[PDB]
Structure 1
Amino acid sequence: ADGVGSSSGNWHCDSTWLGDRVITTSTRTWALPTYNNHLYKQISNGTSGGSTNDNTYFGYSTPWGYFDFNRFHCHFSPRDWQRLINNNWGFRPKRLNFKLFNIQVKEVTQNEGTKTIANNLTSTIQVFTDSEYQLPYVLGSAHQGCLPPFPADVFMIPQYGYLTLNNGSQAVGRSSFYCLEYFPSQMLRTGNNFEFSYQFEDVPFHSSYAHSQSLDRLMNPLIDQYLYYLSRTQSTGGTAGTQQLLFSQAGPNNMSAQAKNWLPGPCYRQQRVSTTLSQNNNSNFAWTGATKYHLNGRDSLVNPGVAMATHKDDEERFFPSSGVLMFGKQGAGKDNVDYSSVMLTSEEEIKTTNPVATEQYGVVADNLQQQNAAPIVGAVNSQGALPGMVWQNRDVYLQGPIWAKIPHTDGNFHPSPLMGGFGLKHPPPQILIKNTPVPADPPTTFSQAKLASFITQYSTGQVSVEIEWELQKENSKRWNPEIQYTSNYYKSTNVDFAVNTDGTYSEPRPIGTRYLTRNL
């Protein structure tokens, strides 16, 4: 039986590699404070202040906290990630299992200047999950507060809030208010534990690999095509340029002219920014020259955007302005931090099937030619989907989000998150948690007013999340060696992906998932 003197569960961290399954598990220690003094609060930002019309919001901030495991580094050690990306073409989640156990609840009081903390054995916590997705789904927005990458850290559970329809800072009629105490939840004292299971809906394998062929080179280099193209519209070698239509079969000599079955993926352009500083223009174009989408009178920066190659061949230094995910190095400020602090991810590997983010999709004609008028060809900056078009989804990273919730809507086109991940119509239910309020002593004479004086309190405990991943084994006849993800051979001041002198864990670089090759 449960009690104050017996542990609720055990610590578990493993990666179990068996066949095509890998079961990763993680346990952490968390601390859940008391938010908003147990109050729901309207929060809003209007254009009245220095804010612009784009940054306005209306919403509510609750007392409730929530768990976010949505980042990969929670479920994989850098070595477990290395086994994954080196040996395997694809992986997708199957089922997860989630546990709260070993709950301590502690009341803290202030006496003069001295602080003291003591167990409260009879206090509870409230934990429910939204299984039916009846709440704003706050995960998948790439917010902070995930379980730490490194198992020895204790983390703080983030506060739960949500945004709703607004006009300016004011609320419209369709604005919703959700009281989270209005769901059924389970109340746990120090001997109780919480668990539930979840099973992912069938989702296409994330493809971890690069194509060994570019999309336009799928041809045979040896043989000509039996198809013809229009090579020359003008009489060649003659003293007069009188036009004549001349046709040719494309072949190894001109491959750019061959007929092709397929087209590159869709293109929505980005601005090009060079890491070398003297090359970039002198001005601030970050917001002005940005690639934005205009929704309901608010210009929203497009980030990261559709999956598009970062740069073409032999340009390392250029990157799309908003196009790439950007991770900070350990201990990076939140405002105007220098380039050296961020870690820019880059897509090299989708250059084959996808257009470069910073260049035009192609060129089309702007006019109908005549003997009088010359042909004029316009550039295509933005290109939607066309039949016979293929593309790769953005690469997942060890620091990046695992999944996102496909919004519930009439229609969607290739519903996969632009941050990368697994688009899910029913993602893992988000788990809400709160400290049940304990009143401070009420007055001796009745008063209707609600009790505003509470015991300062917080709770800590252990959380385990165990995900079962399905693997797609690499089977390939390639003769020569693959590229692998390998740690540096040369000596270092301190080990990568390990604690420093002071005890601070750090991840040196983002690790993309695609080192393997396939035939396109």
Structure 2
Amino acid sequence: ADGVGNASGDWHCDSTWMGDRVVTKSTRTWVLPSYNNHQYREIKSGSVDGSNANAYFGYSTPWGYFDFNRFHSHWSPRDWQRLINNYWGFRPRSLRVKIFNIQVKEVTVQDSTTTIANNLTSTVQVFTDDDYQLPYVVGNGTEGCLPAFPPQVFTLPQYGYATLNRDNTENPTERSSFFCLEYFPSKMLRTGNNFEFTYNFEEVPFHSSFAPSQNLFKLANPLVDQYLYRFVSTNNTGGVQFNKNLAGRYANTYKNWFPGPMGRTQGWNLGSGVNRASVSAFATTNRMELEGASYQVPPQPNGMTNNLQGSNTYALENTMIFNSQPANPGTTATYLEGNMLITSESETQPVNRVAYNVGGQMATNNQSSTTAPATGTYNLQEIVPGSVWMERDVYLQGPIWAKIPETGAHFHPSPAMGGFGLKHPPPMMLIKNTPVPGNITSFSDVPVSSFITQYSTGQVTVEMEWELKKENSKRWNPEIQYTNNYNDPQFVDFAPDSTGEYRTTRPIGTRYLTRPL
């Protein structure tokens, strides 16, 4: 055990469905560049694109990190289908990760030959941050996760963070903090060594994957009248007149429950919708301010629906928008509807309010004999006693969890992009190549800047356990399922191309089952 000619792990990719629970095992091959040539660099930006919200001050590190936080890392398209068609809900239970079969490669360039050899004595460093003392960059929707497709090899992303900057500039504050990652204890691994970590998720609610089977305002019996009466009109000398609420008249009935909060965001017509020409669209987006700068919040808060059933109007600032294929870093190219995976929340429309319409109206004045009653519409409304809504749906291409910010207070900690809000998420796993100095023939007080250039590769297996919520329903007629349906397919979706490129043409969400309110 533990030698250069002995493998330190095996390939595990499987999914075991047992009763309620399911365990998903996933193995990938990674490669780790040596970033910043073993340096910590201070990174910063001023206002770019004419927005001082793009200014920041921070640090980039030599370290890379493992990111497990998208669903397609863990789940197959066929196992995701088996989940969403058969179950009302799921939540994560446990996690364990293993890093094995480490091999370090030294690369040397003489007159552009660039030969590569392996250094058997070189080391890699790995630590997990269990106390959450570092900036947690994982849940923020950024690339670098394990691939969706198991044979694909991936580079680990470089670790970095932004601290406080002052006055919306690139300059630091006195509260700007520097975190050194070598001031943690870490484990040093040669070829025969491996690393293992285990984690238990805290108790969270099930993600509810079902759609409401009736309307929030239609909950009353259509056959029977209400014993309740409504103010209707007023007569020639105004006294107040009342009518009884009748049967299936749902405009007029009394309500116990009210929809979730809403802001109003601009709707845009996809497909054959006409829209408007030559809009720059940045000035008219919804925004919030912090510290004197104005930020776009491209996901909105929960409690709205971006699309209304089979309409082509979308809010686009209430939407999660994906690309059908991965892109190069820093691409400024413009894309169109056909390139994009544009999700729809319309299965929540019974309980949620559409984002591109007003939320209602209220009285704007006091009536008199002289003045008539008046109303006006409101474009935004917030949490109210007796509100019910549905959370953002989760997709096979989307994030699993987020970390709740550490502050005095918060309300209903559900992430806007989706998934499970976690006070103590799965910890970050950080990894770097240990530096090997070059030829140094003399003593100097200044640190060693000349290093052998190296990279390392290996495998990482992740094993998650999921608790499932059975579907128990008395619905007689058949339901909507996620099916594989294509008219005149020229390729099969979720399979490699003739080149070897893996194709995913559409988003897959969780809510196909239907349940009564």
Normalising by structure 1, report the TM-score: 0.96
Matched, 1:131 2:116: no
Measured against aligned partners, the alpha-carbon deviations of 1:454-491 in whole angstroms (never above 9, x if no partner) come to 00100000000000000001001110101000001644
Structure 2 counterpart of 1:255: 250
**RMSD (Å), alpha carbons:** 1.3
Q: Distance in 1 between matches of 2:273 and 2:395?
A: 31
On the 8 A contact 1:397/1:513 being kept in 2, the answer is yes
Structure 2 counterpart of 1:407: 405
SS in 1 for 2:126: strand
- Shift, 1:285, TM fit: 4.5
Structure 2 counterpart of 1:117: 116
- Shift, 1:243, TM fit: 3.1
Measured against aligned partners, the alpha-carbon deviations of 1:346-390 in whole angstroms (never above 9, x if no partner) come to 101111111111111111111111121222212121111110100
The letter for the 2-side match of 1:194 is F
Structure 2 counterpart of 1:480: 477
Matched, 1:279 2:274: yes
Counterpart mapping for 1:143-292 below 5 A: 143-167=142-166, 168-233=169-234, 235=235, 241-252=236-247, 254-276=249-271, 279-292=274-287
On the 8 A contact 2:273/2:313 being kept in 1, the answer is no
Residue of 489, 493, 516 corresponding to 1:492: 489
Measured against aligned partners, the alpha-carbon deviations of 1:212-260 in whole angstroms (never above 9, x if no partner) come to 0110011101000001111223x3xxxxx44342111212352211001
- Shift, 1:342, TM fit: 1.1
- Shift, 1:332, TM fit: 5.2
Residue of 292, 306, 323 corresponding to 1:310: 306
- Shift, 1:294, TM fit: 1.2
On the 8 A contact 1:273/1:320 being kept in 2, the answer is yes
SS in 2 for 1:446: coil
- Shift, 1:282, TM fit: 2.8
Q: Distance in 2 between matches of 1:311 and 1:221?
A: 28
Measured against aligned partners, the alpha-carbon deviations of 1:313-336 in whole angstroms (never above 9, x if no partner) come to 542x11113110000112557432
Structure 2 counterpart of 1:382: 380
Matched, 1:507 2:508: no
- Shift, 1:33, TM fit: 0.5
Of the structure 1 ranges 394-403 and 52-61, higher mean CA displacement relative to structure 2 is found in 52-61
The letter for the 2-side match of 1:507 is T
Structure 1 counterpart of 2:95: 96
Q: Distance in 2 between matches of 1:24 and 1:150?
A: 14
Q: Distance in 1 between matches of 2:486 and 2:506?
A: 16
Q: Distance in 1 between matches of 2:400 and 2:21?
A: 17
Measured against aligned partners, the alpha-carbon deviations of 1:271-297 in whole angstroms (never above 9, x if no partner) come to 111125763233425211101111111
Structure 2 counterpart of 1:370: 368
- The 3 A distance-change label for structure 1 pair 42 and 148 is same
Matched, 1:15 2:32: no
Residue of 294, 297, 310 corresponding to 1:299: 294
The letter for the 2-side match of 1:265 is G
Q: Distance in 1 between matches of 2:325 and 2:49?
A: 31
SS in 1 for 2:258: coil
Matched, 1:2 2:5: no
Structure 2 counterpart of 1:356: 354
Q: Distance in 2 between matches of 1:408 and 1:330?
A: 35
Percent identity reads: 58
Unaligned regions of 5+ residues in structure 2, if any? Answer: none
- Shift, 1:2, TM fit: 0.7
- The 3 A distance-change label for structure 1 pair 131 and 331 is closer
Matched, 1:460 2:461: no
On the 8 A contact 1:45/1:51 being kept in 2, the answer is no
Q: Distance in 1 between matches of 2:152 and 2:436?
A: 29
- Shift, 1:189, TM fit: 0.2
Of the structure 1 ranges 320-329 and 394-403, higher mean CA displacement relative to structure 2 is found in 320-329
Matched, 1:53 2:72: no
Of the structure 1 ranges 10-19 and 263-272, higher mean CA displacement relative to structure 2 is found in 263-272
On the 8 A contact 1:68/1:139 being kept in 2, the answer is yes
On the 8 A contact 2:63/2:159 being kept in 1, the answer is yes
On the 8 A contact 1:290/1:321 being kept in 2, the answer is no
Q: Distance in 2 between matches of 1:61 and 1:51?
A: 24
Of the structure 1 ranges 404-413 and 247-256, higher mean CA displacement relative to structure 2 is found in 247-256
Q: Distance in 2 between matches of 1:55 and 1:179?
A: 25
Measured against aligned partners, the alpha-carbon deviations of 1:168-189 in whole angstroms (never above 9, x if no partner) come to 1000010110000110000000
Q: Distance in 2 between matches of 1:442 and 1:360?
A: 71
Measured against aligned partners, the alpha-carbon deviations of 1:4-58 in whole angstroms (never above 9, x if no partner) come to 00000000000000001000010000000100001111100013x6652111011
Q: Distance in 1 between matches of 2:36 and 2:14?
A: 37
On the 8 A contact 1:286/1:321 being kept in 2, the answer is no
Q: Distance in 2 between matches of 1:424 and 1:149?
A: 23
Counterpart mapping for 1:440-459 below 5 A: 440-443=438-441, 445-459=442-456
Q: Distance in 1 between matches of 2:323 and 2:497?
A: 17
How many equivalent pairs are there? 511
Of the structure 1 ranges 394-403 and 346-355, higher mean CA displacement relative to structure 2 is found in 346-355
The letter for the 1-side match of 2:10 is N
On the 8 A contact 1:343/1:510 being kept in 2, the answer is yes
Normalising by structure 2, report the TM-score: 0.97
- Shift, 1:398, TM fit: 0.2
- The 3 A distance-change label for structure 1 pair 377 and 61 is same
Of the structure 1 ranges 492-501 and 283-292, higher mean CA displacement relative to structure 2 is found in 283-292
- The 3 A distance-change label for structure 1 pair 162 and 248 is same
Unaligned regions of 5+ residues in structure 1, if any? Answer: 236-240
Q: Distance in 2 between matches of 1:160 and 1:403?
A: 19
